[PDB]
């Protein structure tokens, strides 16, 4: 996938500058519907232009539209982490899918 490679490359570029400057997102199981999960968890980051291309690139892999402000849960077992940690985690999962084919 060229699309997959482009996304990996964009994540590498943006996390090589602390990604979204003190914004926190909830973790998720990324092993199950990874792309939509990552978009769902990243769609509500509100003042970070560095993540916009990432958000658009992720939308290309999700087979439904991902809108901001939607209810998921109260995230009881989940945990707030930095966008950068989330994105670096996401990158690992994406590299494996690349490697798997």
């Amino acid at each position: 996938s060229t699309a997959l490679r482009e996304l990996i490359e964009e994540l590498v570029n943006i996390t090589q500058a602390p990604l979204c400057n003190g914004s926190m997102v909830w973790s998720i199981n990324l092993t199950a519907g990874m792309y939509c999960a990552a978009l769902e968890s990243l769609i509500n980051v509100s003042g970070c232009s560095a993540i916009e291309k990432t958000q658009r690139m992720l939308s290309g892999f999700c087979p439904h539209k991902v809108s901001a402000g939607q209810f998921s849960s109260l995230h009881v077992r989940d945990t707030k982490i930095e966008v950068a940690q989330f994105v670096k985690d996401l990158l690992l999962h994406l590299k494996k899918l690349f490697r798997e084919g």
Partner: antibody
Amino acid sequence: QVTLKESGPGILQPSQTLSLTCSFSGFSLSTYGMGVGWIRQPSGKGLEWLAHIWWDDVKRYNPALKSRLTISKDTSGSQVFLKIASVDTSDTATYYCARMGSDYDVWFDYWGQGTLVTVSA
Amino acid sequence: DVQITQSPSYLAASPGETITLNCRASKSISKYLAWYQEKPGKTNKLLIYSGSTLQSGIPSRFSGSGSGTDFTLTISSLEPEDFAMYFCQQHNEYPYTFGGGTKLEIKR
């Protein structure tokens, strides 16, 4: 520093199963980002990618040979193995193992010297 | 499945010359081409990857260029140790495929 070295049968009869070993120093296939592939060159012809394996056991195989190939590593991640089932004379080649220069992408930063395998009666 | 052509497959040049080698893919490979140097009794040496990225510890007189389907390796001011067989490999797409090489030999 990083070295790789192939070991093989030298010669085998057709319909046999070629077993190749790659031994290496200066890295382990239990470290993140590490992986090893097998590439071959029939004489006066070009290189042909066969298979590769990563530290987390993700494997890929050349679809033209997919069924005949099995790649593995040991639990100490210090050797890598290729099996080619049902060899014929088209499998006569020099066989190289090589380390991947990236944690996801497939180009090779270090190569072994190669070993000749002749498949003949 | 991408076929890689290196043409011409033979070149002669005198030291100090600047030369270019061609590598052509049968379909676009974005920028993902690697170049390797091959020498008798030596292990193959990676020079460039992703079209233009110089491997660590390789002299900067090696320069890779191109994108899509047409690629070049330029070696400027050839040193004696620079004469060798040079082959390319696309790493855009599985299965990975190699060009048939160009032998660069010294004119004397």
